[PDB]
Amino acid sequence: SQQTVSPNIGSRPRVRNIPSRISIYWTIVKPGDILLINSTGNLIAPRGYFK
Amino acid sequence: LRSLVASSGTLEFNNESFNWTGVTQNGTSSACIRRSKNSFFSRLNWLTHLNFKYPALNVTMPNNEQFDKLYIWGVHHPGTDKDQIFLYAQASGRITVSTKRSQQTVSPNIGSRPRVRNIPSRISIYWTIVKPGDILLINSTGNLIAPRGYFK
Ligand SMILES: *[C@@H]1O[C@H](CO)[C@@H](O[C@@H]2O[C@H](CO)[C@@H](O[C@@H]3O[C@H](CO)[C@@H](O)[C@H](O)[C@@H]3O)[C@H](O)[C@H]2NC(C)=O)[C@H](O)[C@H]1NC(C)=O
Ligand SMILES: *[C@@H]1O[C@H](CO)[C@@H](O[C@@H]2O[C@H](CO)[C@@H](O)[C@H](O)[C@H]2NC(C)=O)[C@H](O)[C@H]1NC(C)=O
Ligand SMILES: *[C@@H]1O[C@H](CO)[C@@H](O)[C@H](O)[C@H]1NC(C)=O
Ligand SMILES: *[C@@H]1O[C@H](CO)[C@@H](O)[C@H](O)[C@H]1NC(C)=O
C-alpha cells in the first residue's frame, strides 16, 4: 500500500481555542513488509506499533 | 445526497445572508434559461471576481437553530484557462468548507471535458451538515459555487 496526504493550511472553527487540526491515518504492515515514511513537514509520526 | 433529501421529505429552504464583499454575486449562464433570460441554479450563488480581484474569502455561518442545517455548494471546473481568468481573474485555489467536526477541501481542475449542452466545463456538487452547536466556515480564492442558505 501507499498513502499520500497533503497538509492543508487554513483556519477552521476554533476547538479548545485551536483553529488547527490533526487528521489521523493508519497503516497495517504485514510480517514480510517494511514501513516507509517520507515527509518534508507537518507529519505526526508514530512512536511504535500496536498488536 | 439523493436518499438523504428523499428520506427528509422536504425541500424547505431558508435563505441566509453571507458576507460576499470583494466578489461579484449572481453569476449566470446561457445553459440555465429562466423566463427567457440567462440564469443559474435558484439555490446556488455563482461568485465572480470584483474589479479584476478575488480576495481570499473567510465567510462564517453559525447554527443557533437547535436543528441540523443541510448546505449545498459546488466547485466550478472551467474548461479553458482563459475562462478561469474571465471569471475569477486569477488561478484556482483549493475551496475549503469546514466546521468544528468536519472539513472538505476540493481543488478546481481546469480542463475541457466532453461538451454537455455545449458546455465543456462542469460543477461538482458537495454538501455539509452543520449541527446546532457548530459554525459553517467557507474559504475560497475562486471557483466556488456558494450556497444561498440552508435546507431543513
Ligand atoms: C476566518 O474566520 C474566523 C471566524 O470568523 C476567524 O478566525 C478566528 O476566529 C476566532 C473566532 O472564531 C477569533 O477568536 C478571537 O480570538 C481571541 C484570542 O485572540 C479569543 O479570546 C476569542 O475567541 C476571539 O473571538 C480569531 O481572532 C480569528 N482569527 C484571526 C487570526 O483573526 C477570522 O475571522 C478568520 N481567520 C483568518 C486567519 O483570517
Ligand atoms: C484561505 O485559504 C487560503 C488558501 O487556499 C489561504 O491563503 C494563503 O494566503 C497567504 C497570503 O495571504 C499566503 O500564505 C498564501 O498565498 C496562502 N497559503 C497557502 C497555503 O496557499 C488564506 O490564508 C485563507 N484565509 C484567508 C482569510 O486568507
Ligand atoms: C465583510 O467582510 C469584510 C472583509 O472582506 C469586512 O471588512 C467587513 O467588516 C464585513 N462586513 C460585514 C457587514 O460583515
Ligand atoms: C443576488 O440576487 C439575489 C436575488 O436573486 C439577491 O438576494 C442578492 O442580494 C443579489 N446579490 C447582490 C450582490 O445584490
Side-chain angles (χ1 to χ4, degrees):
Chain A
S1 73
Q2 69 214 44
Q3 290 144 268
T4 78
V5 174
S6 194
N8 309 305
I9 303 97
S11 50
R12 285 157 202 100
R14 254 162 165 85
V15 166
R16 299 188 288 283
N17 203 48
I18 312 300
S20 307
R21 294 292 191 270
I22 296 167
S23 302
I24 272 98
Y25 302 90
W26 79 91
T27 317
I28 288 163
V29 177
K30 297 272 186 288
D33 225 323
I34 309 141
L35 178 86
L36 187 55
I37 309 171
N38 168 303
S39 171
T40 77
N42 309 78
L43 157 90
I44 307 299
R47 288 204 200 274
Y49 64 94
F50 284 97
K51 284 277 195 81
Chain B
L1 180 64
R2 181 201 178 243
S3 71
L4 188 108
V5 176
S7 196
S8 200
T10 191
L11 268 176
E12 196 195 323
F13 179 90
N14 299 118
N15 259 111
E16 285 190 309
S17 56
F18 285 84
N19 187 14
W20 305 123
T21 50
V23 286
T24 304
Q25 274 173 68
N26 293 318
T28 60
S29 179
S30 69
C32 214
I33 298 306
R34 189 176 282 104
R35 279 178 250 93
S36 299
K37 298 290 186 84
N38 280 19
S39 179
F40 192 65
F41 303 109
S42 78
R43 303 315 193 188
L44 288 163
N45 196 346
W46 195 343
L47 312 180
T48 314
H49 74 76
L50 187 88
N51 310 135
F52 250 86
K53 272 188 172 196
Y54 209 114
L57 304 164
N58 193 53
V59 198
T60 262
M61 204 63 240
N63 200 349
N64 304 132
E65 304 296 332
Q66 70 205 25
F67 66 74
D68 298 0
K69 307 202 279 187
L70 170 76
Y71 283 112
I72 316 302
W73 50 276
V75 163
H76 178 262
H77 297 279
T80 58
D81 179 63
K82 310 298 130 206
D83 253 35
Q84 173 76 54
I85 303 298
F86 171 83
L87 299 158
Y88 312 108
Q90 56 166 94
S92 61
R94 291 177 64 84
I95 295 100
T96 302
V97 349
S98 54
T99 57
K100 292 215 275 290
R101 288 153 184 89
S102 73
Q103 69 214 44
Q104 290 144 268
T105 78
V106 174
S107 194
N109 309 305
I110 303 97
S112 50
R113 285 157 202 100
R115 254 162 165 85
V116 166
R117 299 188 288 283
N118 203 48
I119 312 300
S121 307
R122 294 292 191 270
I123 296 167
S124 302
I125 272 98
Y126 302 90
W127 79 91
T128 317
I129 288 163
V130 177
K131 297 272 186 288
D134 225 323
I135 309 141
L136 178 86
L137 187 55
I138 309 171
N139 168 303
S140 171
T141 77
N143 309 78
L144 157 90
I145 307 299
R148 288 204 200 274
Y150 64 94
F151 284 97
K152 284 277 195 81

